[model samples]
Target chain A: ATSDTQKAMAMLIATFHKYSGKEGDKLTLSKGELKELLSAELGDIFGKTTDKAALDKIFKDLDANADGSVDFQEYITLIACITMLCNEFFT
Target chain B: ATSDTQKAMAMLIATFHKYSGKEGDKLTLSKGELKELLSAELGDIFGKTTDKAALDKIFKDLDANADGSVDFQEYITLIACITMLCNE
Candidate 1:
């Protein structure tokens, strides 16, 4: 998968490990936790929003399976969605 | 437009067509609908927790144009923000 999403996923997972506690905790994300995460880690880059509603909305759109949660696979989809959207905007 | 983003854009447009009914549906997003979607599609992967605040903050940030709603342009910027932060 040469897609930017796949690349971003690998990067995110790696970055997660690089900065976060450890591996076991990596997959364990809650809506609130993930929201906090993006905010804390990505705040500067994203310029301050990165809050609950945004994550909620984005995640909701990404929750293609309607499972109410986001795992690695689901996250991959989200990352893909993000990448696709970014491509549309800047490119 | 050889940037990964362009290719990705084409992919998105194609996928949107393959799945979404067509055209921009309200830009067509509502909190209720989006939340429902995440729960439905990605629910299995995520547990439950406290990140709601983060999402709340993000939308406000994305509303840069101050239009209350996100048009295609604003949305595109939002996506770029995600890609950068997520490290694409």
Candidate 2:
């Protein structure tokens, strides 16, 4: 059986692909695709993702390479950061 | 309701603490503790944890601070790296 955290990682990868497959590229997420991904996968964590300004800020921050889309590396970094924050909260 | 990502984050944290709290420094993992955590939680992915050499190498690499223990940051980095590889 897969460990809980392993399952979590699989879900994260699956979720990214689920959204990344939608628009232009099959491996990256355009702004609109990312918006939907965040809203669907992290609505509870990133409250008010529907807010345009906040969403824009998040998108800009996440698009690390400034290629106009979020790739898997950028996406994983965000998850890692969030996981660190959550660990701090618990500690 | 928490989203799947959020839930995943929570589980990762919970799992870390579950192992980290076992012995010495309630916030970090000693070699033995790390070995147990890896075997129990990641045996499927990291087969052969029973191998002392492999386990030693992993522990040394993960102890980023070179302090003879693996902290949360190092553990998270390992997870992130593994996740990225999985993503690729």
Top candidate (TM-score): 2
In the range A1-91, model 1's lDDT, one tens digit per residue, is 2443334334555543333333235544455555555554445434355345566677676455665544444444444445435542223
Q: B1-88 in candidate 1: lDDT tens per residue?
A: 1433234445544433332333335443333333333343334432377376555666676555554444434443444445435422
Q: What is the C-alpha lDDT of each candidate?
A: 0.45, 0.73
- lDDT at residue B88 of model 1 (Cα atoms): 26
lDDT of 2 by residue, A1-91 (tens): 7888788778777888888898888988898887777767777655454467765776788787888888776676666656566343233
List candidate 2 stretches off by more than 4 Å.
A47-66, A86-91, B49-64, B70-73, B83-88
Q: How close is candidate 2 to the true structure, as a TM-score?
A: 0.70
Per-residue lDDT of candidate 2, residues B1-88 (tens digit): 7777777767877888888888878878788877777777777656663577766776677786777787766776667666565431
- Full-model lDDT, candidate 1: 0.45
Q: What is the C-alpha RMSD of each candidate to the true structure, in Å?
A: 14.7, 4.3
